[PDB]
Amino acid sequence: LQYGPLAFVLGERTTRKLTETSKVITVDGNICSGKGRLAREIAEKLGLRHFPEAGIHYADSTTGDGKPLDVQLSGNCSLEKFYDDPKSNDGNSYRLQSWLYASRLLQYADALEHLLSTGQGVVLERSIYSDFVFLEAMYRQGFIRKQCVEHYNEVKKVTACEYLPPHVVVYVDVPVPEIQSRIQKKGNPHEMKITAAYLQDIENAYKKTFLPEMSEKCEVLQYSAREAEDAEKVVEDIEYLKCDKGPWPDQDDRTFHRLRMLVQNKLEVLNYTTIPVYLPEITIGAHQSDRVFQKFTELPGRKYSPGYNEDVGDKWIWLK
Amino acid sequence: MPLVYMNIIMAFAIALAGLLMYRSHLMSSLLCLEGMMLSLFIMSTLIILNTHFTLANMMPIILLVFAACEAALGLSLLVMVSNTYGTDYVQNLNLLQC
Amino acid sequence: PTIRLQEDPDPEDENLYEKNPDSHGYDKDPIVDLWNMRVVFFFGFSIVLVLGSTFVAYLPDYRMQEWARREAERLVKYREANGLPLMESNCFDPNKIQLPEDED
Amino acid sequence: KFYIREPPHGSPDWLKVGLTLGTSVFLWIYLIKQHKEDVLEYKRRNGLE
Amino acid sequence: MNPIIYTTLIMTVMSGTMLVMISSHWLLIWIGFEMNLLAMIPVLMKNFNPRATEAATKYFLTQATASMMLMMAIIINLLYSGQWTITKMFNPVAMTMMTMALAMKLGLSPFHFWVPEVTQGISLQAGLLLLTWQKLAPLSVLCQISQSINPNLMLTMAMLSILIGGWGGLNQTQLRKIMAYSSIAHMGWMTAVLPYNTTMTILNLLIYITMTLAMFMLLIHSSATTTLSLSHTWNKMPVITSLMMVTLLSMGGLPPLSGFMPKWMIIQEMTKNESIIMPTLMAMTALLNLYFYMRLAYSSSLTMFPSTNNMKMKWQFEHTKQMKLLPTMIVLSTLVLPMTPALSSLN
Amino acid sequence: MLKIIIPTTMLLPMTWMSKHNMIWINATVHSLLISLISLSLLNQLGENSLNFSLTFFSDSLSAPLLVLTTWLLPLMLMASQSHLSKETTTRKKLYITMLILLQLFLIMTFTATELILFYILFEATLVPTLIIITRWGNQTERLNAGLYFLFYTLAGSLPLLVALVYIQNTTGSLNFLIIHYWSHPLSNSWSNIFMWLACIMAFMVKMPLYGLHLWLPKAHVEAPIAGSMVLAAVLLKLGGYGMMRITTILNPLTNYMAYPFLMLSMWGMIMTSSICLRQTDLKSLIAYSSVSHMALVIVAIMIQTPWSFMGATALMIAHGLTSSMLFCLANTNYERVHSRTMILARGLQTLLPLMATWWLVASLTNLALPPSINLIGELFIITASFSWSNITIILMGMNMMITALYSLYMLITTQRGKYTHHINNIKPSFTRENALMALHILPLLLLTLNPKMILGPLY
Amino acid sequence: LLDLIWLETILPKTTSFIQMKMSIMVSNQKGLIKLYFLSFLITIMISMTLFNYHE
Amino acid sequence: NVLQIVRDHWVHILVPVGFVFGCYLDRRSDEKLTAFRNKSLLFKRELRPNEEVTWK
Amino acid sequence: ARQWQPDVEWAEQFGGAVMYPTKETAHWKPPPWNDVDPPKDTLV
Amino acid sequence: TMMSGRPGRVPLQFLPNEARSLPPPKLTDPRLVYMGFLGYCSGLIDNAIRRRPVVSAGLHRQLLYVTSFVFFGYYLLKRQDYMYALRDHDMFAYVKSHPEDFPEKDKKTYGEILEEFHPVR
Numbered sequence A: 001l002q003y004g005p006l007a008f009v010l011g012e013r014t015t016r017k018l019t020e021t022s023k024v025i026t027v028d029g030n031i032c033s034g035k036g037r038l039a040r041e042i043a044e045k046l047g048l049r050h051f052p053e054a055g056i057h058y059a060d061s062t063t064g065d066g067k068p069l070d071v072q073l074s075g076n077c078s079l080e081k082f083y084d085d086p087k088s089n090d091g092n093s094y095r096l097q098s099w100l101y102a103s104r105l106l107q108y109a110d111a112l113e114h115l116l117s118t119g120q121g122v123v124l125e126r127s128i129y130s131d132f133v134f135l136e137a138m139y140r141q142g143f144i145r146k147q148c149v150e151h152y153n154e155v156k157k158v159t160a161c162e163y164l165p166p167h168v169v170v171y172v173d174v175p176v177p178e179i180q181s182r183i184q185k186k187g188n189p190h191e192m193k194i195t196a197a198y199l200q201d202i203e204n205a206y207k208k209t210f211l212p213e214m215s216e217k218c219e220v221l222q223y224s225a226r227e228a229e230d231a232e233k234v235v236e237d238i239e240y241l242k243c244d245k246g247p248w249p250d251q252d253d254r255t256f257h258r259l260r261m262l263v264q265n266k267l268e269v270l271n272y273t274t275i276p277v278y279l280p281e282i283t284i285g286a287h288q289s290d291r292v293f294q295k296f297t298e299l300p301g302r303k304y305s306p307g308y309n310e311d312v313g314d315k316w317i318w319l320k
Numbered sequence B: 001m002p003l004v005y006m007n008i009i010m011a012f013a014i015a016l017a018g019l020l021m022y023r024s025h026l027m028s029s030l031l032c033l034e035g036m037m038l039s040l041f042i043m044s045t046l047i048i049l050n051t052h053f054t055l056a057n058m059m060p061i062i063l064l065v066f067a068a069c070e071a072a073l074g075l076s077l078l079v080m081v082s083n084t085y086g087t088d089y090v091q092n093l094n095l096l097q098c
Numbered sequence C: 001p002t003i004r005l006q007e008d009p010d011p012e013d014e015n016l017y018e019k020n021p022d023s024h025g026y027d028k029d030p031i032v033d034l035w036n037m038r039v040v041f042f043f044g045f046s047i048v049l050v051l052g053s054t055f056v057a058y059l060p061d062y063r064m065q066e067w068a069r070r071e072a073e074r075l076v077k078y079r080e081a082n083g084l085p086l087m088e089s090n091c092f093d094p095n096k097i098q099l100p101e102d103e104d
Numbered sequence D: 001k002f003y004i005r006e007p008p009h010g011s012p013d014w015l016k017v018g019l020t021l022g023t024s025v026f027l028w029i030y031l032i033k034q035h036k037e038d039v040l041e042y043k044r045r046n047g048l049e
Numbered sequence E: 001m002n003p004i005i006y007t008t009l010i011m012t013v014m015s016g017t018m019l020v021m022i023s024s025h026w027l028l029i030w031i032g033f034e035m036n037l038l039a040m041i042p043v044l045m046k047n048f049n050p051r052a053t054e055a056a057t058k059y060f061l062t063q064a065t066a067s068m069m070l071m072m073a074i075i076i077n078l079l080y081s082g083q084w085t086i087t088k089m090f091n092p093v094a095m096t097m098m099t100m101a102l103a104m105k106l107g108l109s110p111f112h113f114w115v116p117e118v119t120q121g122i123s124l125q126a127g128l129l130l131l132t133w134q135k136l137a138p139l140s141v142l143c144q145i146s147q148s149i150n151p152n153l154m155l156t157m158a159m160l161s162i163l164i165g166g167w168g169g170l171n172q173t174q175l176r177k178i179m180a181y182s183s184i185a186h187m188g189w190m191t192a193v194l195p196y197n198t199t200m201t202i203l204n205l206l207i208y209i210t211m212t213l214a215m216f217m218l219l220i221h222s223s224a225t226t227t228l229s230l231s232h233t234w235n236k237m238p239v240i241t242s243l244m245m246v247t248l249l250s251m252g253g254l255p256p257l258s259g260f261m262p263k264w265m266i267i268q269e270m271t272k273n274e275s276i277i278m279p280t281l282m283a284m285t286a287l288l289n290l291y292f293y294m295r296l297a298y299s300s301s302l303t304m305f306p307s308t309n310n311m312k313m314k315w316q317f318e319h320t321k322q323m324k325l326l327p328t329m330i331v332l333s334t335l336v337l338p339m340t341p342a343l344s345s346l347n
Numbered sequence F: 001m002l003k004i005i006i007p008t009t010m011l012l013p014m015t016w017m018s019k020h021n022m023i024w025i026n027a028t029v030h031s032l033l034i035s036l037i038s039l040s041l042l043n044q045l046g047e048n049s050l051n052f053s054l055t056f057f058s059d060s061l062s063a064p065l066l067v068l069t070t071w072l073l074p075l076m077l078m079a080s081q082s083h084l085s086k087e088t089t090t091r092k093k094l095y096i097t098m099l100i101l102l103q104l105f106l107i108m109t110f111t112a113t114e115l116i117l118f119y120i121l122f123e124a125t126l127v128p129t130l131i132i133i134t135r136w137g138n139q140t141e142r143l144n145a146g147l148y149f150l151f152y153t154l155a156g157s158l159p160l161l162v163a164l165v166y167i168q169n170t171t172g173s174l175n176f177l178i179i180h181y182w183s184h185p186l187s188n189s190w191s192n193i194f195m196w197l198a199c200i201m202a203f204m205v206k207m208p209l210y211g212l213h214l215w216l217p218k219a220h221v222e223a224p225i226a227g228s229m230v231l232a233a234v235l236l237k238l239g240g241y242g243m244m245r246i247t248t249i250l251n252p253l254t255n256y257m258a259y260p261f262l263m264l265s266m267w268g269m270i271m272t273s274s275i276c277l278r279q280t281d282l283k284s285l286i287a288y289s290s291v292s293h294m295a296l297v298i299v300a301i302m303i304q305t306p307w308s309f310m311g312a313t314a315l316m317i318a319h320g321l322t323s324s325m326l327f328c329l330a331n332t333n334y335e336r337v338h339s340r341t342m343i344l345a346r347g348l349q350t351l352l353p354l355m356a357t358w359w360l361v362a363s364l365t366n367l368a369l370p371p372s373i374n375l376i377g378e379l380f381i382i383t384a385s386f387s388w389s390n391i392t393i394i395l396m397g398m399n400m401m402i403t404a405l406y407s408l409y410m411l412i413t414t415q416r417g418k419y420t421h422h423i424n425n426i427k428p429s430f431t432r433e434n435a436l437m438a439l440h441i442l443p444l445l446l447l448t449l450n451p452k453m454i455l456g457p458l459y
Numbered sequence G: 001l002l003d004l005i006w007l008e009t010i011l012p013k014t015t016s017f018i019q020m021k022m023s024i025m026v027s028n029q030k031g032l033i034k035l036y037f038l039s040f041l042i043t044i045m046i047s048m049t050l051f052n053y054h055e
Numbered sequence H: 001n002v003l004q005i006v007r008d009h010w011v012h013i014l015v016p017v018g019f020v021f022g023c024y025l026d027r028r029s030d031e032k033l034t035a036f037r038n039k040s041l042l043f044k045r046e047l048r049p050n051e052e053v054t055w056k
Numbered sequence I: 001a002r003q004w005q006p007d008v009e010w011a012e013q014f015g016g017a018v019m020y021p022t023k024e025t026a027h028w029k030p031p032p033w034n035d036v037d038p039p040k041d042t043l044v
Numbered sequence J: 001t002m003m004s005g006r007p008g009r010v011p012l013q014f015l016p017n018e019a020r021s022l023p024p025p026k027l028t029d030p031r032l033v034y035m036g037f038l039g040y041c042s043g044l045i046d047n048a049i050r051r052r053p054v055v056s057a058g059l060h061r062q063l064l065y066v067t068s069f070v071f072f073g074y075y076l077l078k079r080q081d082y083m084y085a086l087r088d089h090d091m092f093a094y095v096k097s098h099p100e101d102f103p104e105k106d107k108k109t110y111g112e113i114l115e116e117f118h119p120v121r
């Protein structure tokens, strides 16, 4: 039985599967920080489920086969081109920003669905609550316009208000010269073109806005570059927290039922991402839309429902 | 038709006109609604008492019961309106204009 | 962006005579093209046109125009042999008509 | 292939198919029997056969 | 809201409507109306926001005034004849009061003002309920006392409703207000034939209920509440937009679609009496409803509007919950005209 | 007559189940077979109709129209399969479905034995045409053209429905046979005058009458080639069929009620014919010529003589064929140069000789060259009008002088002169286009060989 | 003068203008229940005076 | 070879089958209008000693 | 060469508060994307 | 209105006993075939909406659609025929019981009736 009103009237309640160790955690940091490894260590030590940071092709991994699709069919944006030409006149910067925000929203919905269906906790490498800093980094450097900022703000206001903030916010603080040195030592040619002002803007928006905002409703555990390697210390710091300030203690069975109905039905989650606001950077013409949609339909397992595609090995179709 | 029936009908008409006119407060409109209920109850009671309809005597009581429901309903809505605006002014209820 | 949409450019016309010098103007695939031409010509010019015109030209005279001619010849012969006016101005026999007795 | 197991099973739901076919067959048999009964009843009333 | 409480409220609304239908007593019909309104008010407020509270308050005030007038009409009828049975309504003043109260409950012009705002102020499910199930009881009461319907008042209100719905629908961009104005026009069409034949009224009611259910279920499937938000559906659900266009054409009244049958039968029934001018005016006025239906069809199905990039992600996700009877409702809303004589099973 | 109706409803699923690259072949072949089958309806009786069943019947007026429709469908498919090459298979099947539904509705319309069913199918024909025009048109004027086409028709047709139901209530039946046998004169009353107007105005709009014709130039120009063909060839003749079916009950009121329309039909005949002299768009020129010819048909129907009816039937058939051929010829140049301006592409006889002779024969047929059926119908109508009034010839004569004046003019503008220099994308004419022109033009000559088949029941 | 100006003016353009004006007049309401219930009172009084009198 | 070509061109029999069905339905329809068969004042004819109906 | 389809300029005429903008309703604003007006920060 | 109140009518029968004296509709009735076609169309639309192969996705559910539509249509046709038979029976009885309101007029031949002639010219 798929979860719904019928499964709620009889039997299934979610407050009987929350076991005080759920503690939705998002690990946060500037570019080229050890936040990913720290998140993985925290997840494998606390017994939670780790979510790798949502990229351009995150949605492709959760639908059909996990293999990513073409950039023209999903995303229509690349990070390498943003690093090469951040001021390109085709609108790649804000298109990438909006696609990344939608991917993060989808990942947050999936994490919340897993948490409310199994009771197991989740660890995230970023969230929709901290994506905006990158947006600000594009605005202060002149990469995007003010109308793009307004559209982002409208979408965030109509989307993120329906979910619960994470219990614990973990921040890995690494100074700008150190992350610049790490980028130099990394080896990716495209990342070498990141100016210091971009990272400084990210850090400024991160310290001045994100952390103060999440302080009033989440447990914020700031760290340093040297404190990140010893993940056992971070884990035992998490085990001795008091999650008493957020809206989580004020959640009943009915609110949890509404949230669980919302986190599934990913179409409902993504509804307000495609509002009819005609920004030139993200608006697509009728001919291009039709061509790309027809190309997407021609994919091996995308013409029909996930159980009615004969050309991927689905048998007994006529009896379903 | 006696004069008392005419007075009761005039009272009902006055209460209906008072409801149809809105000044500022929703409370006054609810008061007019309860006044219409009272006038209907009085008219029904007089009619049922004049013509000795014994089994009809309970039906005004039922009327009063549903009156409370309406009043209750209105009060609930009024509270929400106040919680949205701090006043029960009908001028604030204009969001559905556009 | 100094533009308004992410729109595909208008493609140029594809000349059918380029990849197929004998293209018949029916389809890009030469085999389906040739068979479309053949079926159009056979069922349009050969079957419907000529055979249908032959069928129309030899339709039986359900309109009864030679019958009317023969009847007219017989009637004319009879009436001329009996010295009759060959046609009466009254389509129906006046004896079977009851006019109003008076109009005054 | 599919990353998820496609909740609607790759083999058809034998229970659902079973009772769907069963109710279709039952409806058809009931309709046939009803038609025969009304034919006989109408013939009996009107004195035809 | 708790699912059990929501089910109880919906069942209470349905039970109030059933009580109105199955009661031979005026007091019991009034009690059914009261129960219907009492249980219906929270349903409009299931999703809490200032607009829902606005719609609930306006609906409650309108229905309370209509109930007051209905009870006064019942009391006057009792005064002039000691009868409690829903019958010929021996008094004309009480009969006029009942006609006006029921017209205000239905939303007939000039009491239509509440319909566009309430429908816009509530969700699509609440709008579906309001525009489909809430019209049964007042229409049933009107049918039961059709012998004493004053033809002048009822026909004037019906013509006003048709004209006002047709004119108001032209100016609307939001879909809920368009549906409300179409509801007002169809209410006028239904009530115009009421004094002559209630079977035609029931047939029009059934055809409208089918079409409205199909329309609202399509608008819920494609989560669109505005014209431009519906312009994005072709890039995700072309079949849904095509079915929506066919359903809109059916509501327009074009043959051989289902929507032509009710107006055709009503025109025939009216022309069985003398009644020549009024059906002609009704048709030339329903032309406006067809016009804004066609405008919606242009914006939604017959042209391809620009889309957004994020829609690509929506391409990878199917619908979680599918509404039942949507294909059946679409089929009944389009391909039913050849079965027109079956209306003889309605009297 | 279900032996013709059912094969179209079988064209539907065969098209929807054919493979992607075989839809056009199957559709064309089976439509040609259906037209061959329907050709058997031309064996008409001399006194009464062919009463097949209680719902369908055929006489010598509806049979040529049915044959014309069944023959026109394959031509529409042939011309449509060129500009829909890049279209997806589903939408190509949808277009073919629209055409098939239009043909089926027309077939049922031309043989409905009672007036309400005829009206229902007559309005049902509107939906496929509107969808075609507003979905597969090229310019942004297609929306307004579709709106005009829909509302002009409906505004005149709803009062027709009211009048029809009133007539059925008064007399008890609307079957054409019972209506004709039980016909009674109409009194000189205001109620009878408005009943006449309600019965006549729908078909006046569908002709269209001069004054209510503004929808036709919009609809015929913005529509795709198949839509233009079906509009000019068949859909304009629905009004004529309805007029010559319903005028039996309108007598003797018509004797004094046709006076305005006749004037609008005659003077307008001149006016539209003059407009073609100053038209910078080829499709608009063809549309206005269609308007003038249909006004002549209106005159023929209104004056109501046997010669008038024979001429009207002949002119309807001839104009349908001629307008279809002219629209196809214009569309060939449009696909060549992607513009509808007449003086853009000039001197095409040098580069397209066979297409030039197709243009010449189409223009010669348009201006009523003897002994074509165009001239037969026009001359019969002219003789009937001269019997009606000896002054009408003047106007008639004027029209003739204007008609050729623009016809050859178009032939001179597009085909003669010198070629435009910068245009270098004029490819040789394809076999499909030449076959389409031949299949348009050969039936005209074969019909003037045996013209009694298109002279109507009055023959 | 005739086709593009006056024939357009009489039938379709006048109809469109009148329908647009009537739509603007009808639809544009202030959204306040005070005016709506004032109109309801006026309608009730008119119906009582006009239709009810002529029984 | 028969299987694939049949599964490819089975759609070419729909129209001939439709025409045959239409002819059969026309026969069934016009066999219901025999209320005046051999009863016309113009075609009342004596039945031959071997036939049973003037027309089918 | 290709079929004309609506653009942003064409679509923006269906994105207003009401059709046929006038002087009185020029200052009307379309309702929020989700039908949730911002909470009025009423002073307590 | 007209048929709502009739003597000896059970309220919610939907099929009175006296309806069994009428010939039942044939199973090959064209209206029943149309109802089956409606069921098939409903099944096809169900397949198309849920993004499944329209022609061949679910055969059992399409069969259920068709049989449900046919099943409902059979009783719908029975009730329709019964109501039309009732209408004709009532009309004939009313005509028979009121001879003065439906008198048989004198038969006149076209040779006696004088119809005015309107020439066309």
Ligand SMILES: CCCCCCCCCCCCCCCCCC(=O)OC[C@H](COP(=O)([O-])OCC(O)COP(=O)([O-])OC[C@@H](COC(=O)CCCCCCCCCCCCCCCCC)OC(=O)CCCCCCCCCCCCCCCCC)OC(=O)CCCCCCCCCCCCCCCCC
Residues within 6 Å of the ligand: E238, E239, E242, E243, E246, E256, E301, E334, E335, F009, F013, F014, F016, F017, F090, F091, F094, F097, F101, F127, F128, F131, F135, H014, H017, J041, J044, J045, J048, J052, J053, J054, J055
């Ligand atoms: C009167 C006479 C009879 C007529 C009756 C009425 C018409 C017929 C009934 C109509 C209802 C039935 C089907 C409706 C649901 C189907 C939906 C659909 O899309 O079909 C896809 C489907 C193909 O899709 P697929 O194979 O799954 O894979 C491709 C993907 O789906 C690809 O999917 P996609 O996502 O890419 O598709 C996108 C596309 C999809 O959009 C659509 O396809 C539109 C869907 C139609 C809307 C239906 C609305 C309700 C019906 C009302 C009809 C009104 C009729 C009155 C006239 C007015 C016309 C509007 O949308 C667009 O591209 C936008 C284009 C805009 C066009 C606007 C016009 C649309 C409305 C026109 C409706 C007219 C009727 C069409 C009937 C056939 C349509 C399939 O089509 C079919 O295969 C079904 C056709 C019928 C099957 C018959 C086969 C049975 C066996 C054959 C043999 C017969 C007996 C043999 C025995 C003999 C002895 C040997």
Ligand SMILES: CCCCCCCCCCCCCCCCC[C@@H](O)O[C@H](CO[C@H](O)CCCCCCCCCCCCCCC)COP(=O)(O)OCC[N+](C)(C)C
Residues within 6 Å of the ligand: C048, C049, C052, C053, C054, C056, C057, C058, F039, F064, F065, F067, F068, F071, F317, F443, F446, F447, F449, F450
């Ligand atoms: C490219 C090279 C060009 C130059 C070379 C030309 C080669 C030689 C051609 C020149 C010869 C000219 C022909 C001379 C006339 C002879 C034919 C004539 O005798 O046949 C006519 C017959 O013509 C046909 O009837 C024409 C049929 C009409 C067309 C059929 C329709 C085909 C379907 C196409 C769709 C049409 C849709 C439009 C609505 C109908 C006469 O009719 P009729 O005297 O009585 O019947 C004679 C038989 N009888 C005596 C037993 C009665």
Ligand SMILES: CCCCCCCCCCCCCCCCC[C@@H](O)O[C@H](CO[C@H](O)CCCCCCCCCCCCCCC)COP(=O)(O)OCC[N+](C)(C)C
Residues within 6 Å of the ligand: F188, F189, F190, F193, F210, F211, F212, F257, F260, F261, F264
């Ligand atoms: C753009 C093109 C649109 C189509 C145009 C169609 C035209 C339709 C007009 C139909 C003509 C006949 C209508 C009236 C019949 C008689 C004409 C009128 O002069 O009547 C006279 C009567 O004198 C007065 O004129 C009476 C009528 C006065 C009112 C009519 C004026 C309307 C103004 C014109 C408006 C333009 C029409 C289009 C409107 C949208 C005749 O005197 P009389 O012999 O004793 O009466 C004969 C009729 N009876 C026997 C039934 C009584």
Ligand SMILES: CCCCCCCCCCCCCCCCC[C@@H](O)O[C@H](CO[C@H](O)CCCCCCCCCCCCCCC)COP(=O)(O)OCC[N+](C)(C)C
Residues within 6 Å of the ligand: E203, E206, E207, E210, E258, E332, E333, E336, E339, E340, E341, E342, E343, E345, E346, E347, J004, J011, J012, J013, J014, J076
């Ligand atoms: C587009 C079509 C919409 C149709 C709406 C839904 C279709 C399914 C209908 C559901 C069938 C069950 C309903 C009732 C069955 C058993 C109950 C039985 O007792 O009902 C009796 C009789 O059943 C119903 O009355 C008739 C229901 C039949 C509905 C079908 C008619 C549709 C109109 C024609 C359009 C063509 C549709 C073709 C099929 C889709 C009631 O008798 P009565 O107490 O005396 O009526 C009181 C009200 N009156 C007197 C004023 C009428």
Ligand SMILES: CCCCCCCC/C=C\CCCCCCCC(=O)O[C@H](COC(=O)CCCCCCC/C=C/CCCCCCCC)COP(=O)(O)OCCN
Residues within 6 Å of the ligand: E274, E275, E276, E277, E280, F152, F153, F155, F156, F159, F162, F163, F166, F190, F191, F192, F194, F195, F196, F197, F198, F201, F205, F212
């Ligand atoms: C593209 C635009 C075309 C517009 C065409 C629309 C107008 C068509 C002409 C008017 C049609 C309406 C006529 C009504 C239907 C006919 C029914 C009838 O004639 O019955 C008469 C009823 O006649 C009427 O009632 C007709 C009243 C007309 C009301 C509608 C007015 C519409 C506009 C009228 C003026 C314009 C007409 C011509 C316009 C031409 C288009 C420009 C007899 O009924 P009884 O009452 O029983 O009388 C006998 C017992 N004493």
Ligand SMILES: Nc1ncnc2c1ncn2[C@@H]1O[C@H](COP(=O)(O)OP(=O)(O)O)[C@@H](O)[C@H]1O
Residues within 6 Å of the ligand: A030, A031, A032, A033, A034, A035, A036, A053, A079, A096, A097, A100, A101, A131, A134, A135, A191
């Ligand atoms: N909202 C965003 N906007 C632009 N770029 C982003 C955004 N989110 C992530 N990125 C890019 O994704 C890249 C990888 O992120 P990061 O976590 O810092 O590296 P790593 O995975 O090695 O730890 C970075 O170069 C970062 O710039």
